[PDB]
């Protein structure tokens, strides 16, 4: 603990994204929004707009 900031430990995590000519298996939460009924809304279910 008695070191300078340059010598103190730092935990590093590197996120790399492997994008091949293969199906994506990781996607974003896609901004899960609440359901609204009995009101004219612009809906999108699983990409179906």
């Amino acid at each position, epitope marked *: 603990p*008695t070191y300078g900031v340059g*010598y103190q430990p730092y935990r590093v995590v590197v996120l790399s994204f492997e994008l091949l000519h293969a199906p994506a298996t990781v996607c974003g939460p896609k901004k899960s929004t609440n359901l609204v009924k009995n009101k004219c809304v612009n809906f999108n279910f699983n990409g179906l707009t």
Partner: antibody
Amino acid sequence: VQLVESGPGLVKPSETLSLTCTVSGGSISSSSHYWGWIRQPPGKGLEWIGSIYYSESAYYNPSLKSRVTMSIDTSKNQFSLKLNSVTAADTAVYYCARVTEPRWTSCYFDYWGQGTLVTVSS
Amino acid sequence: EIVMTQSPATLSLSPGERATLSCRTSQSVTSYLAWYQQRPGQAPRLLIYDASDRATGIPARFSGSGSGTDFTLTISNLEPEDFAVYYCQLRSNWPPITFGQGTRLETK
């Protein structure tokens, strides 16, 4: 800065030797310095006993670790040393010093205290 | 084990000359070293840290050859009050904070 030692000057064999070092030139709660104890028998070389950090923990000698403990008190701004089962080989002058360990192996005692002579005899 | 060996045990030189104390570590790791001076009846005084850095208040005549396993403290111009016992101190992994056997510098 200054360091002053305090404690009984006589310890009977096979008993705990207690010492307390009080500093007044700075702060022991600083996160840049250790506070250590270094002893030397009369006419002999220096022997680092142990160094304590402000939080609680400390590290000691690989020979005296069984019968040694260190404590700290930020409120009173002083750190203490206990040496259990003192034999006749502990008859020595004990200084308390200020340690700076910046990189890995850089560990020097910046300012020493005058030290007190504890002679262990019956 | 990283054992510390200083040399020589006693050094006989007169004021005006230059003294060369050697502090070699075992055949082992290499990094920094600290040199301390201790006069009779006084607590040891820090002379040099990080294998050559004059402490706060050390004259320019003190220097350190901070190099491999072997280290060297050099005193350019021996002054009358520069004759004392000199200890080199390392901080290895195990044992931590090893001290040298000490070099006694006296007036020939």
